[PDB]
Symmetry: D2
Subunit: 106 residues, 4 copies
Protein backbone atom coordinates (compact mmCIF):
# COMPACT_ATOMS: atom_id res chain seq x y z
CA UNK A 1 0.00 0.00 0.00
CA UNK A 2 0.98 3.67 -0.20
CA UNK A 3 2.01 6.01 2.64
CA UNK A 4 -1.60 7.12 2.98
CA UNK A 5 -3.12 3.71 3.61
CA UNK A 6 -0.13 2.54 5.69
CA UNK A 7 -0.35 5.68 7.82
CA UNK A 8 -4.06 4.97 8.15
CA UNK A 9 -3.53 1.37 9.27
CA UNK A 10 -0.78 2.66 11.55
CA UNK A 11 -3.09 5.22 13.12
CA UNK A 12 -6.05 2.82 13.40
CA UNK A 13 -4.12 0.18 15.36
CA UNK A 14 -2.93 2.83 17.82
CA UNK A 15 -6.59 3.22 18.77
CA UNK A 16 -6.91 -0.57 18.87
CA UNK A 17 -4.05 -0.73 21.35
CA UNK A 18 -5.55 2.07 23.44
CA UNK A 19 -8.89 0.25 23.63
CA UNK A 20 -7.45 -3.28 23.80
CA UNK A 21 -8.47 -5.61 26.63
CA UNK A 22 -5.96 -8.48 26.48
CA UNK A 23 -2.37 -9.04 25.29
CA UNK A 24 -3.41 -10.87 22.12
CA UNK A 25 -5.23 -7.78 20.81
CA UNK A 26 -2.31 -5.46 21.54
CA UNK A 27 0.18 -7.97 20.16
CA UNK A 28 -2.06 -8.33 17.10
CA UNK A 29 -2.23 -4.55 16.84
CA UNK A 30 1.52 -4.01 17.11
CA UNK A 31 2.14 -6.75 14.56
CA UNK A 32 -0.16 -5.01 12.09
CA UNK A 33 1.64 -1.74 12.80
CA UNK A 34 4.97 -3.48 12.20
CA UNK A 35 3.68 -4.65 8.82
CA UNK A 36 2.37 -1.20 7.90
CA UNK A 37 5.64 0.44 8.98
CA UNK A 38 7.86 -1.93 6.97
CA UNK A 39 5.70 -1.54 3.90
CA UNK A 40 5.66 2.25 4.15
CA UNK A 41 9.40 2.43 4.74
CA UNK A 42 9.90 2.03 0.98
CA UNK A 43 7.83 5.05 -0.05
CA UNK A 44 8.84 8.67 -0.74
CA UNK A 45 6.95 11.52 0.98
CA UNK A 46 5.34 14.03 -1.44
CA UNK A 47 7.38 16.84 0.13
CA UNK A 48 10.72 15.14 -0.62
CA UNK A 49 9.78 13.67 -4.01
CA UNK A 50 11.99 16.36 -5.50
CA UNK A 51 14.86 15.49 -3.14
CA UNK A 52 17.62 12.98 -3.86
CA UNK A 53 16.63 9.48 -2.64
CA UNK A 54 19.77 9.64 -0.52
CA UNK A 55 19.95 13.31 0.46
CA UNK A 56 20.13 14.68 4.00
CA UNK A 57 16.33 14.95 4.09
CA UNK A 58 15.51 11.48 2.77
CA UNK A 59 18.08 9.78 5.01
CA UNK A 60 16.35 11.48 7.94
CA UNK A 61 12.94 10.30 6.71
CA UNK A 62 14.20 6.71 6.42
CA UNK A 63 15.78 7.08 9.87
CA UNK A 64 12.36 8.08 11.16
CA UNK A 65 10.70 4.81 10.25
CA UNK A 66 13.65 2.95 11.73
CA UNK A 67 12.98 4.65 15.05
CA UNK A 68 9.25 3.89 14.90
CA UNK A 69 9.92 0.29 13.93
CA UNK A 70 12.31 -0.13 16.84
CA UNK A 71 9.75 1.32 19.19
CA UNK A 72 7.18 -1.16 17.84
CA UNK A 73 9.72 -3.95 18.38
CA UNK A 74 10.25 -3.08 22.02
CA UNK A 75 6.49 -2.70 22.46
CA UNK A 76 5.98 -6.22 21.14
CA UNK A 77 8.39 -7.61 23.74
CA UNK A 78 6.25 -6.02 26.43
CA UNK A 79 2.95 -7.25 24.96
CA UNK A 80 4.50 -10.71 24.54
CA UNK A 81 5.34 -10.72 28.25
CA UNK A 82 1.68 -10.02 29.04
CA UNK A 83 2.50 -6.48 30.16
CA UNK A 84 -0.58 -4.76 28.71
CA UNK A 85 -0.22 -1.47 30.56
CA UNK A 86 3.47 -1.12 29.66
CA UNK A 87 2.69 -1.96 26.05
CA UNK A 88 -0.02 0.70 25.85
CA UNK A 89 2.38 3.17 27.46
CA UNK A 90 4.93 2.41 24.74
CA UNK A 91 2.28 2.93 22.05
CA UNK A 92 1.49 6.35 23.52
CA UNK A 93 5.17 7.22 23.84
CA UNK A 94 6.07 6.34 20.24
CA UNK A 95 3.42 8.90 19.32
CA UNK A 96 6.24 11.45 19.51
CA UNK A 97 7.93 9.69 16.61
CA UNK A 98 4.76 10.06 14.56
CA UNK A 99 4.54 13.78 15.41
CA UNK A 100 8.24 14.58 14.96
CA UNK A 101 8.30 13.29 11.40
CA UNK A 102 5.01 14.96 10.49
CA UNK A 103 6.31 18.33 11.69
CA UNK A 104 9.32 17.85 9.40
CA UNK A 105 8.10 16.11 6.26
CA UNK A 106 4.31 16.14 6.34
CA UNK B 1 3.77 -11.20 -1.95
CA UNK B 2 4.69 -14.85 -1.44
CA UNK B 3 7.93 -15.39 0.49
CA UNK B 4 9.44 -17.09 -2.56
CA UNK B 5 8.63 -14.22 -4.91
CA UNK B 6 10.56 -11.87 -2.66
CA UNK B 7 13.43 -14.34 -2.61
CA UNK B 8 13.33 -14.37 -6.44
CA UNK B 9 13.50 -10.57 -6.42
CA UNK B 10 16.48 -10.74 -4.07
CA UNK B 11 18.23 -13.32 -6.24
CA UNK B 12 17.80 -11.62 -9.63
CA UNK B 13 18.90 -8.20 -8.43
CA UNK B 14 22.11 -9.62 -7.03
CA UNK B 15 22.82 -10.44 -10.69
CA UNK B 16 21.73 -7.00 -11.86
CA UNK B 17 24.19 -5.42 -9.43
CA UNK B 18 27.08 -7.68 -10.46
CA UNK B 19 26.51 -6.85 -14.13
CA UNK B 20 25.96 -3.13 -13.51
CA UNK B 21 27.83 -0.54 -15.60
CA UNK B 22 27.14 2.47 -13.39
CA UNK B 23 25.91 3.73 -10.01
CA UNK B 24 22.36 4.21 -11.27
CA UNK B 25 21.93 0.51 -11.94
CA UNK B 26 23.45 -0.62 -8.64
CA UNK B 27 21.27 1.77 -6.67
CA UNK B 28 18.17 0.77 -8.56
CA UNK B 29 18.84 -2.90 -7.91
CA UNK B 30 19.78 -2.26 -4.28
CA UNK B 31 16.54 -0.35 -3.67
CA UNK B 32 14.47 -3.17 -5.13
CA UNK B 33 16.33 -5.55 -2.83
CA UNK B 34 15.54 -3.34 0.15
CA UNK B 35 11.87 -3.56 -0.75
CA UNK B 36 11.91 -7.34 -1.19
CA UNK B 37 13.72 -7.98 2.08
CA UNK B 38 11.28 -5.75 3.96
CA UNK B 39 8.28 -7.54 2.48
CA UNK B 40 10.01 -10.88 3.11
CA UNK B 41 10.59 -9.81 6.70
CA UNK B 42 6.82 -9.77 7.31
CA UNK B 43 6.38 -13.38 6.23
CA UNK B 44 6.11 -16.68 8.07
CA UNK B 45 8.40 -19.27 6.47
CA UNK B 46 7.13 -22.85 5.91
CA UNK B 47 9.62 -24.34 8.36
CA UNK B 48 8.41 -21.96 11.08
CA UNK B 49 4.67 -21.82 10.39
CA UNK B 50 4.20 -24.09 13.42
CA UNK B 51 6.02 -21.69 15.76
CA UNK B 52 4.49 -18.71 17.56
CA UNK B 53 5.19 -15.18 16.31
CA UNK B 54 6.91 -14.85 19.69
CA UNK B 55 9.58 -17.54 19.67
CA UNK B 56 13.41 -17.68 19.45
CA UNK B 57 13.14 -18.92 15.89
CA UNK B 58 10.81 -16.18 14.60
CA UNK B 59 12.77 -13.53 16.52
CA UNK B 60 15.95 -14.89 14.88
CA UNK B 61 14.20 -14.98 11.51
CA UNK B 62 13.31 -11.30 11.89
CA UNK B 63 16.88 -10.53 13.01
CA UNK B 64 18.25 -12.08 9.84
CA UNK B 65 16.32 -9.60 7.75
CA UNK B 66 17.50 -6.68 9.88
CA UNK B 67 21.02 -7.90 9.08
CA UNK B 68 20.28 -8.02 5.35
CA UNK B 69 18.48 -4.67 5.22
CA UNK B 70 21.33 -3.06 7.15
CA UNK B 71 23.84 -4.44 4.66
CA UNK B 72 21.68 -3.19 1.81
CA UNK B 73 21.70 0.15 3.64
CA UNK B 74 25.51 0.28 3.85
CA UNK B 75 25.82 -0.73 0.18
CA UNK B 76 23.53 2.16 -0.74
CA UNK B 77 25.82 4.57 1.08
CA UNK B 78 28.83 3.48 -1.00
CA UNK B 79 26.78 3.71 -4.20
CA UNK B 80 25.55 7.23 -3.47
CA UNK B 81 29.15 8.26 -2.88
CA UNK B 82 30.09 7.08 -6.37
CA UNK B 83 31.87 3.94 -5.16
CA UNK B 84 30.28 1.62 -7.72
CA UNK B 85 32.91 -1.08 -7.20
CA UNK B 86 32.66 -1.11 -3.40
CA UNK B 87 28.87 -1.27 -3.58
CA UNK B 88 29.10 -4.27 -5.91
CA UNK B 89 31.57 -5.96 -3.57
CA UNK B 90 29.15 -5.30 -0.70
CA UNK B 91 26.30 -7.02 -2.55
CA UNK B 92 28.65 -9.96 -3.12
CA UNK B 93 29.54 -9.85 0.57
CA UNK B 94 25.98 -10.00 1.87
CA UNK B 95 25.44 -13.28 0.04
CA UNK B 96 26.72 -14.83 3.28
CA UNK B 97 23.63 -13.52 5.08
CA UNK B 98 21.45 -15.23 2.47
CA UNK B 99 23.22 -18.55 3.06
CA UNK B 100 23.21 -18.26 6.84
CA UNK B 101 19.44 -17.87 7.04
CA UNK B 102 18.71 -20.58 4.49
CA UNK B 103 20.87 -23.12 6.30
CA UNK B 104 18.61 -22.61 9.33
CA UNK B 105 15.13 -21.94 7.99
CA UNK B 106 14.95 -23.03 4.38
CA UNK C 1 33.98 1.80 33.63
CA UNK C 2 32.75 -1.69 34.53
CA UNK C 3 29.21 -3.01 33.96
CA UNK C 4 28.12 -2.36 37.52
CA UNK C 5 29.30 1.28 37.60
CA UNK C 6 27.85 2.14 34.20
CA UNK C 7 24.53 0.86 35.52
CA UNK C 8 24.76 3.34 38.39
CA UNK C 9 25.49 6.18 36.02
CA UNK C 10 22.41 5.10 34.08
CA UNK C 11 20.21 5.13 37.17
CA UNK C 12 21.57 8.43 38.47
CA UNK C 13 20.92 10.36 35.27
CA UNK C 14 17.47 8.80 34.98
CA UNK C 15 16.73 10.72 38.20
CA UNK C 16 18.37 13.85 36.81
CA UNK C 17 16.00 13.70 33.83
CA UNK C 18 13.07 13.21 36.21
CA UNK C 19 14.00 16.38 38.11
CA UNK C 20 15.05 18.33 34.99
CA UNK C 21 13.49 21.70 34.16
CA UNK C 22 14.97 22.59 30.77
CA UNK C 23 16.00 20.76 27.60
CA UNK C 24 19.66 21.53 28.31
CA UNK C 25 19.53 19.46 31.50
CA UNK C 26 17.83 16.49 29.78
CA UNK C 27 20.19 16.44 26.81
CA UNK C 28 23.22 16.31 29.10
CA UNK C 29 21.82 13.48 31.24
CA UNK C 30 20.79 11.47 28.17
CA UNK C 31 24.20 12.06 26.62
CA UNK C 32 25.72 10.58 29.76
CA UNK C 33 23.23 7.72 29.65
CA UNK C 34 24.32 6.83 26.11
CA UNK C 35 28.02 6.80 26.99
CA UNK C 36 27.45 4.58 30.03
CA UNK C 37 25.23 2.39 27.85
CA UNK C 38 27.71 2.01 24.98
CA UNK C 39 30.47 1.49 27.53
CA UNK C 40 28.54 -1.23 29.35
CA UNK C 41 27.60 -3.05 26.14
CA UNK C 42 31.01 -4.75 25.87
CA UNK C 43 30.68 -6.46 29.27
CA UNK C 44 29.64 -9.96 30.22
CA UNK C 45 27.31 -10.15 33.24
CA UNK C 46 28.08 -12.46 36.18
CA UNK C 47 24.96 -14.53 35.37
CA UNK C 48 26.42 -15.50 32.01
CA UNK C 49 30.13 -15.53 32.90
CA UNK C 50 30.43 -19.23 32.15
CA UNK C 51 28.71 -19.34 28.77
CA UNK C 52 29.92 -19.01 25.18
CA UNK C 53 30.42 -15.31 24.38
CA UNK C 54 28.46 -16.30 21.29
CA UNK C 55 25.73 -18.21 23.14
CA UNK C 56 22.00 -17.54 22.71
CA UNK C 57 22.01 -15.84 26.10
CA UNK C 58 24.81 -13.41 25.32
CA UNK C 59 23.12 -12.61 22.02
CA UNK C 60 19.84 -11.85 23.82
CA UNK C 61 21.71 -9.84 26.47
CA UNK C 62 23.36 -7.71 23.80
CA UNK C 63 19.97 -7.26 22.13
CA UNK C 64 18.61 -5.79 25.34
CA UNK C 65 21.33 -3.16 25.28
CA UNK C 66 20.63 -2.28 21.66
CA UNK C 67 17.02 -1.66 22.69
CA UNK C 68 18.13 0.58 25.57
CA UNK C 69 20.60 2.60 23.52
CA UNK C 70 17.99 2.72 20.76
CA UNK C 71 15.55 4.26 23.22
CA UNK C 72 18.10 6.74 24.57
CA UNK C 73 18.80 7.75 20.97
CA UNK C 74 15.15 8.62 20.28
CA UNK C 75 14.91 10.42 23.61
CA UNK C 76 17.92 12.48 22.57
CA UNK C 77 16.12 13.53 19.43
CA UNK C 78 13.19 14.80 21.48
CA UNK C 79 15.52 16.68 23.85
CA UNK C 80 17.44 18.23 20.97
CA UNK C 81 14.15 19.53 19.58
CA UNK C 82 13.57 21.29 22.90
CA UNK C 83 10.80 18.92 23.97
CA UNK C 84 11.62 18.50 27.68
CA UNK C 85 8.42 16.71 28.68
CA UNK C 86 8.46 14.46 25.62
CA UNK C 87 12.02 13.38 26.43
CA UNK C 88 11.20 12.91 30.12
CA UNK C 89 8.36 10.58 29.12
CA UNK C 90 10.81 8.63 26.99
CA UNK C 91 13.20 8.15 29.91
CA UNK C 92 10.30 6.94 32.03
CA UNK C 93 9.15 4.58 29.28
CA UNK C 94 12.53 2.89 28.77
CA UNK C 95 12.49 1.82 32.41
CA UNK C 96 10.65 -1.22 31.05
CA UNK C 97 13.84 -2.25 29.22
CA UNK C 98 15.98 -1.89 32.35
CA UNK C 99 13.42 -4.09 34.11
CA UNK C 100 13.28 -6.81 31.44
CA UNK C 101 17.02 -7.43 31.35
CA UNK C 102 17.41 -7.31 35.12
CA UNK C 103 14.78 -9.96 35.73
CA UNK C 104 16.44 -12.15 33.14
CA UNK C 105 20.16 -11.53 33.59
CA UNK C 106 20.85 -9.86 36.95
CA UNK D 1 41.50 4.62 26.09
CA UNK D 2 40.84 7.49 23.70
CA UNK D 3 39.62 7.59 20.09
CA UNK D 4 43.16 7.08 18.88
CA UNK D 5 43.75 3.97 20.97
CA UNK D 6 40.46 2.49 19.80
CA UNK D 7 41.35 3.12 16.18
CA UNK D 8 44.69 1.40 16.66
CA UNK D 9 42.93 -1.61 18.17
CA UNK D 10 40.56 -1.71 15.18
CA UNK D 11 43.47 -1.65 12.71
CA UNK D 12 45.49 -4.32 14.57
CA UNK D 13 42.71 -6.87 14.69
CA UNK D 14 41.93 -6.26 11.04
CA UNK D 15 45.47 -7.53 10.37
CA UNK D 16 44.98 -10.44 12.78
CA UNK D 17 41.78 -11.47 11.03
CA UNK D 18 43.51 -11.41 7.63
CA UNK D 19 46.24 -13.80 8.78
CA UNK D 20 44.01 -15.95 11.02
CA UNK D 21 44.14 -19.73 10.54
CA UNK D 22 40.91 -20.61 12.38
CA UNK D 23 37.51 -19.52 13.70
CA UNK D 24 38.56 -18.97 17.32
CA UNK D 25 41.24 -16.51 16.27
CA UNK D 26 38.76 -14.56 14.16
CA UNK D 27 36.05 -14.45 16.85
CA UNK D 28 38.53 -13.11 19.39
CA UNK D 29 39.68 -10.42 16.97
CA UNK D 30 36.13 -9.35 16.06
CA UNK D 31 35.13 -9.25 19.74
CA UNK D 32 37.98 -6.84 20.42
CA UNK D 33 36.97 -4.74 17.42
CA UNK D 34 33.42 -4.60 18.80
CA UNK D 35 34.52 -3.19 22.15
CA UNK D 36 36.91 -0.70 20.50
CA UNK D 37 34.21 0.48 18.08
CA UNK D 38 31.70 0.96 20.90
CA UNK D 39 34.34 2.69 22.99
CA UNK D 40 35.19 5.04 20.12
CA UNK D 41 31.52 5.69 19.34
CA UNK D 42 31.21 7.84 22.49
CA UNK D 43 34.07 10.13 21.47
CA UNK D 44 33.90 13.58 19.85
CA UNK D 45 36.46 13.66 17.00
CA UNK D 46 38.91 16.60 16.78
CA UNK D 47 37.33 17.70 13.50
CA UNK D 48 33.93 17.91 15.18
CA UNK D 49 35.11 19.46 18.47
CA UNK D 50 33.67 22.88 17.59
CA UNK D 51 30.33 21.53 16.36
CA UNK D 52 27.31 21.35 18.67
CA UNK D 53 26.97 17.92 20.37
CA UNK D 54 23.70 17.38 18.54
CA UNK D 55 24.63 18.72 15.11
CA UNK D 56 24.10 16.83 11.83
CA UNK D 57 27.83 16.03 11.76
CA UNK D 58 27.80 14.27 15.12
CA UNK D 59 24.63 12.37 14.20
CA UNK D 60 26.32 11.17 11.00
CA UNK D 61 29.47 10.34 12.98
CA UNK D 62 27.38 8.24 15.37
CA UNK D 63 25.60 6.55 12.45
CA UNK D 64 28.94 5.47 10.97
CA UNK D 65 29.90 3.59 14.11
CA UNK D 66 26.45 1.96 14.16
CA UNK D 67 27.22 0.68 10.67
CA UNK D 68 30.68 -0.57 11.67
CA UNK D 69 29.35 -2.28 14.78
CA UNK D 70 26.60 -3.90 12.72
CA UNK D 71 29.12 -5.21 10.22
CA UNK D 72 31.19 -6.65 13.07
CA UNK D 73 28.00 -8.24 14.41
CA UNK D 74 27.31 -9.98 11.08
CA UNK D 75 30.94 -11.06 10.77
CA UNK D 76 30.73 -12.58 14.28
CA UNK D 77 27.76 -14.71 13.22
CA UNK D 78 29.84 -15.98 10.32
CA UNK D 79 32.82 -16.73 12.56
CA UNK D 80 30.57 -18.29 15.21
CA UNK D 81 29.33 -20.73 12.57
CA UNK D 82 32.94 -21.59 11.77
CA UNK D 83 32.89 -19.96 8.34
CA UNK D 84 36.44 -18.61 8.57
CA UNK D 85 36.93 -17.43 5.01
CA UNK D 86 33.54 -15.74 4.99
CA UNK D 87 34.23 -13.89 8.23
CA UNK D 88 37.58 -12.71 6.93
CA UNK D 89 35.88 -11.49 3.74
CA UNK D 90 33.43 -9.71 6.00
CA UNK D 91 36.23 -7.98 7.90
CA UNK D 92 37.92 -6.85 4.68
CA UNK D 93 34.62 -5.57 3.26
CA UNK D 94 33.86 -3.40 6.28
CA UNK D 95 37.08 -1.54 5.54
CA UNK D 96 34.85 0.57 3.27
CA UNK D 97 33.16 1.84 6.40
CA UNK D 98 36.51 2.76 7.96
CA UNK D 99 37.24 4.69 4.75
CA UNK D 100 33.92 6.53 4.45
CA UNK D 101 34.06 7.98 7.97
CA UNK D 102 37.74 8.90 7.69
CA UNK D 103 37.06 10.75 4.44
CA UNK D 104 34.55 12.88 6.32
CA UNK D 105 35.92 13.24 9.82
CA UNK D 106 39.56 12.16 10.12
C1 LIG E 1 2.59 5.66 14.82
C2 LIG E 1 2.89 6.84 14.15
C3 LIG E 1 2.25 7.37 13.02
C4 LIG E 1 0.90 7.53 12.81
C5 LIG E 1 -0.23 7.07 13.71
C6 LIG E 1 0.74 8.26 11.58
C7 LIG E 1 -0.49 8.63 11.02
C8 LIG E 1 -0.65 9.35 9.84
C9 LIG E 1 -1.94 9.71 9.26
C10 LIG E 1 -3.32 9.33 9.81
C11 LIG E 1 -1.69 10.42 8.13
C12 LIG E 1 -2.73 10.98 7.17
C13 LIG E 1 -2.96 10.11 5.95
C14 LIG E 1 -3.87 10.75 4.92
O1 LIG E 1 -3.58 11.90 4.51
O2 LIG E 1 -4.87 10.11 4.51
C15 LIG E 1 -0.24 10.50 8.00
C16 LIG E 1 0.42 11.14 6.95
C17 LIG E 1 1.82 11.21 6.78
N1 LIG E 1 2.75 10.66 7.65
FE1 LIG E 1 2.33 9.55 9.41
N2 LIG E 1 1.98 8.56 11.01
C18 LIG E 1 2.91 8.01 11.88
C19 LIG E 1 4.31 8.09 11.71
C20 LIG E 1 4.98 8.73 10.66
C21 LIG E 1 6.42 8.80 10.55
C22 LIG E 1 7.39 8.17 11.56
C23 LIG E 1 6.72 9.52 9.39
C24 LIG E 1 7.96 9.88 8.85
C25 LIG E 1 9.14 9.18 9.04
C26 LIG E 1 5.42 9.88 8.82
C27 LIG E 1 5.22 10.60 7.63
C28 LIG E 1 3.99 10.96 7.07
C29 LIG E 1 3.81 11.71 5.84
C30 LIG E 1 4.92 12.27 4.95
C31 LIG E 1 2.47 11.85 5.66
C32 LIG E 1 1.78 12.45 4.45
C33 LIG E 1 1.51 11.37 3.41
C34 LIG E 1 0.76 11.89 2.20
O3 LIG E 1 0.35 13.06 2.23
O4 LIG E 1 0.58 11.12 1.23
N3 LIG E 1 4.38 9.40 9.60
N4 LIG E 1 0.39 9.82 9.05
C1 LIG F 1 20.05 -11.26 -0.56
C2 LIG F 1 20.07 -12.55 -0.07
C3 LIG F 1 19.11 -13.55 -0.35
C4 LIG F 1 18.93 -14.18 -1.54
C5 LIG F 1 19.67 -13.79 -2.83
C6 LIG F 1 17.93 -15.22 -1.35
C7 LIG F 1 17.48 -16.13 -2.32
C8 LIG F 1 16.54 -17.15 -2.11
C9 LIG F 1 16.09 -18.13 -3.11
C10 LIG F 1 16.53 -18.21 -4.58
C11 LIG F 1 15.21 -18.98 -2.50
C12 LIG F 1 14.31 -20.07 -3.10
C13 LIG F 1 12.98 -19.45 -3.57
C14 LIG F 1 12.02 -20.47 -4.16
O1 LIG F 1 12.12 -21.66 -3.83
O2 LIG F 1 11.16 -20.07 -4.96
C15 LIG F 1 15.14 -18.55 -1.12
C16 LIG F 1 14.35 -19.21 -0.18
C17 LIG F 1 14.24 -18.84 1.15
N1 LIG F 1 14.90 -17.75 1.71
FE1 LIG F 1 16.23 -16.53 0.89
N2 LIG F 1 17.49 -15.21 -0.02
C18 LIG F 1 18.21 -14.21 0.58
C19 LIG F 1 18.16 -13.94 1.95
C20 LIG F 1 17.39 -14.61 2.88
C21 LIG F 1 17.37 -14.27 4.31
C22 LIG F 1 18.17 -13.15 4.96
C23 LIG F 1 16.51 -15.12 4.91
C24 LIG F 1 16.15 -15.27 6.28
C25 LIG F 1 16.32 -14.38 7.30
C26 LIG F 1 15.97 -15.97 3.86
C27 LIG F 1 15.00 -16.97 4.06
C28 LIG F 1 14.49 -17.79 3.06
C29 LIG F 1 13.58 -18.87 3.29
C30 LIG F 1 12.90 -19.22 4.62
C31 LIG F 1 13.41 -19.52 2.12
C32 LIG F 1 12.51 -20.75 1.87
C33 LIG F 1 11.12 -20.32 1.38
C34 LIG F 1 10.25 -21.50 0.98
O3 LIG F 1 10.76 -22.65 0.99
O4 LIG F 1 9.07 -21.29 0.65
N3 LIG F 1 16.54 -15.65 2.62
N4 LIG F 1 15.94 -17.41 -0.89
C1 LIG G 1 18.20 2.64 32.10
C2 LIG G 1 18.05 1.30 32.48
C3 LIG G 1 18.87 0.68 33.42
C4 LIG G 1 19.14 1.13 34.67
C5 LIG G 1 18.71 2.44 35.31
C6 LIG G 1 19.92 0.10 35.33
C7 LIG G 1 20.38 0.20 36.63
C8 LIG G 1 21.11 -0.77 37.27
C9 LIG G 1 21.61 -0.61 38.64
C10 LIG G 1 21.57 0.67 39.50
C11 LIG G 1 22.26 -1.75 38.94
C12 LIG G 1 22.87 -2.09 40.30
C13 LIG G 1 21.95 -3.03 41.08
C14 LIG G 1 22.34 -3.16 42.54
O1 LIG G 1 22.37 -2.14 43.25
O2 LIG G 1 22.62 -4.29 42.98
C15 LIG G 1 22.22 -2.62 37.74
C16 LIG G 1 22.82 -3.87 37.62
C17 LIG G 1 22.76 -4.65 36.46
N1 LIG G 1 22.10 -4.29 35.29
FE1 LIG G 1 21.14 -2.68 34.92
N2 LIG G 1 20.14 -0.98 34.50
C18 LIG G 1 19.51 -0.64 33.33
C19 LIG G 1 19.47 -1.45 32.19
C20 LIG G 1 20.03 -2.70 32.07
C21 LIG G 1 19.98 -3.50 30.85
C22 LIG G 1 19.45 -2.98 29.53
C23 LIG G 1 20.63 -4.69 31.10
C24 LIG G 1 20.83 -5.80 30.25
C25 LIG G 1 20.89 -5.70 28.85
C26 LIG G 1 21.08 -4.56 32.47
C27 LIG G 1 21.82 -5.51 33.14
C28 LIG G 1 22.29 -5.39 34.45
C29 LIG G 1 23.04 -6.43 35.09
C30 LIG G 1 23.40 -7.78 34.44
C31 LIG G 1 23.35 -5.99 36.34
C32 LIG G 1 24.15 -6.70 37.44
C33 LIG G 1 25.58 -6.18 37.45
C34 LIG G 1 26.39 -6.70 38.63
O3 LIG G 1 25.88 -6.66 39.77
O4 LIG G 1 27.53 -7.14 38.42
N3 LIG G 1 20.70 -3.36 33.06
N4 LIG G 1 21.49 -2.00 36.72
C1 LIG H 1 37.66 -1.03 10.92
C2 LIG H 1 37.58 0.33 10.66
C3 LIG H 1 38.46 1.32 11.14
C4 LIG H 1 39.81 1.28 11.23
C5 LIG H 1 40.75 0.10 10.91
C6 LIG H 1 40.25 2.61 11.63
C7 LIG H 1 41.58 2.97 11.79
C8 LIG H 1 41.98 4.27 12.12
C9 LIG H 1 43.35 4.66 12.36
C10 LIG H 1 44.56 3.76 12.25
C11 LIG H 1 43.34 5.97 12.68
C12 LIG H 1 44.52 6.83 13.06
C13 LIG H 1 44.73 6.77 14.57
C14 LIG H 1 45.73 7.80 15.04
O1 LIG H 1 46.04 8.72 14.26
O2 LIG H 1 46.20 7.70 16.20
C15 LIG H 1 41.96 6.40 12.65
C16 LIG H 1 41.54 7.68 13.00
C17 LIG H 1 40.22 8.12 13.10
N1 LIG H 1 39.12 7.33 12.84
FE1 LIG H 1 39.17 5.37 12.28
N2 LIG H 1 39.19 3.46 11.79
C18 LIG H 1 38.07 2.70 11.50
C19 LIG H 1 36.76 3.13 11.50
C20 LIG H 1 36.32 4.43 11.78
C21 LIG H 1 34.92 4.86 11.78
C22 LIG H 1 33.74 3.95 11.46
C23 LIG H 1 34.89 6.18 12.12
C24 LIG H 1 33.79 7.08 12.15
C25 LIG H 1 32.43 6.75 12.22
C26 LIG H 1 36.29 6.55 12.36
C27 LIG H 1 36.71 7.80 12.78
C28 LIG H 1 38.02 8.16 13.01
C29 LIG H 1 38.45 9.49 13.37
C30 LIG H 1 37.55 10.69 13.61
C31 LIG H 1 39.81 9.47 13.44
C32 LIG H 1 40.71 10.63 13.88
C33 LIG H 1 41.36 10.38 15.25
C34 LIG H 1 42.19 11.55 15.73
O3 LIG H 1 43.01 12.07 14.95
O4 LIG H 1 42.02 11.96 16.90
N3 LIG H 1 37.15 5.47 12.12
N4 LIG H 1 41.12 5.34 12.31
CA1 LIG I 1 5.21 -20.07 -0.48
CA1 LIG J 1 16.03 -13.27 -14.51
CA1 LIG K 1 14.04 1.86 -12.46
CA1 LIG L 1 29.81 1.11 42.09
CA1 LIG M 1 47.58 10.10 16.05
ZN1 LIG N 1 13.73 -8.32 20.15
ZN1 LIG O 1 22.73 5.61 6.59
ZN1 LIG P 1 18.81 9.68 15.07
ZN1 LIG Q 1 22.86 -11.32 15.71
Amino acid sequence: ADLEDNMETLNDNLKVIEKADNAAQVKDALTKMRAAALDAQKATPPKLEDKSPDSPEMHDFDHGFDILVGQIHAALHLANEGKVKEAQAAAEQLKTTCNACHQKYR
